[PDB]
């Protein structure tokens, strides 16, 4: 338990990176969270929406 | 059928060709939600309701 001051720095960085990775599975209002289905499912004029 | 007794047909195990449907001119209203009609050829679906 002595090395906590050094361990929490790694824990914080690993958590920030994990949250950044986890943010790619969000729709944000779109119809899908993956860009390939959107590009392979919608016509060019209204995909930009 | 009637409105309150609307039919529902199960569609499965198809080589589904939507090009003939698109090229037909007997439909006054041809509107699709979320799918481009020209892109219906490549996509695969687990089940289709009619």
Curated annotation (Swiss-Prot), chain A:
Coiled coil: 7-49
Outcome of substituting residue 40 to A: In strain: Alpha/B.1.1.7
Superkingdom as given in the UniProt entry: Viruses
Effect of residue 12 to H: In strain: Omicron/BA.1, Omicron/BA.2, Omicron/BA.2.12.1, Omicron/BA.2.75, Omicron/BA.4, Omicron/BA.5, Omicron/BQ.1.1, Omicron/XBB.1.5, Omicron/EG.5.1
Purpose: Subunit of the fusion protein that is processed upon entry into the host cell. Mediates fusion of the virion and cellular membranes by functioning as a class I viral fusion protein. Contains a viral fusion peptide that is unmasked after S2 cleavage. This cleavage can occur at the cell membrane by host TMPRSS2 or during endocytosis by host CSTL. In either case, this triggers an extensive and irreversible conformational change that leads to fusion of the viral envelope with the cellular cytoplasmic membrane, releasing viral genomic RNA into the host cell cytoplasm.
Protein name: Spike protein S2'
Organism: Severe acute respiratory syndrome coronavirus 2
Residues of the full protein shown: 943 to 991 of 1273
UniProtKB/Swiss-Prot annotation, chain B:
General function of this protein: Attaches the virion to the cell membrane by interacting with host receptor, initiating the infection. The major receptor is host ACE2. When S2/S2' has been cleaved, binding to the receptor triggers direct fusion at the cell membrane. When S2/S2' has not been cleaved, binding to the receptor results in internalization of the virus by endocytosis using host TFRC and GRM2 and leading to fusion of the virion membrane with the host endosomal membrane. Alternatively, may use NRP1/NRP2 and integrin as entry receptors.
Consequence of substituting residue 21 to I: In strain: Omicron/XBB.1.5, Omicron/EG.5.1
Shown chain mapped onto the complete sequence: 348 to 397 of 1273
Annotated phenotype, changing residue 29 to A: In strain: Omicron/BA.2, Omicron/BA.2.12.1, Omicron/BA.4, Omicron/BA.5, Omicron/BQ.1.1, Omicron/XBB.1.5, Omicron/EG.5.1
Subunit structure, interactors included: Binds to host ACE2. RBD also interacts with the N-linked glycan on 'Asn-90' of ACE2. Cleavage of S generates a polybasic C-terminal sequence on S1 that binds to host Neuropilin-1 (NRP1) and Neuropilin-2 (NRP2) receptors. Interacts with host integrin alpha-5/beta-1 (ITGA5:ITGB1) and with ACE2 in complex with integrin alpha-5/beta-1 (ITGA5:ITGB1). May interact via cytoplasmic c-terminus with M protein. May interact (via N-terminus) with host bilirubin and biliverdin, thereby preventing antibody binding to the SARS-CoV-2 spike NTD via an allosteric mechanism.
Protein name: Spike protein S1
Protein origin, superkingdom: Viruses
């Amino acid at each position: 338990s002595a090395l906590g001051k050094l361990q929490n720095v790694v824990n914080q960085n690993a958590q920030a990176l994990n949250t950044l990775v986890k943010q790619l599975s969000s729709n944000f209002g779109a119809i899908s969270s993956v860009l390939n289905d959107i590009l392979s499912r919608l016509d060019p004029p209204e995909a930009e929406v | 059928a009637s409105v309150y007794a609307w039919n529902r047909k199960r569609i499965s195990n198809c080589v589904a060709d939507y090009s003939v449907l698109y090229n037909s001119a007997s439909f006054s209203t041809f509107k699709c939600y979320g799918v481009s009609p020209t892109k219906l050829n490549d996509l695969c679906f687990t089940n289709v309701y009619a």
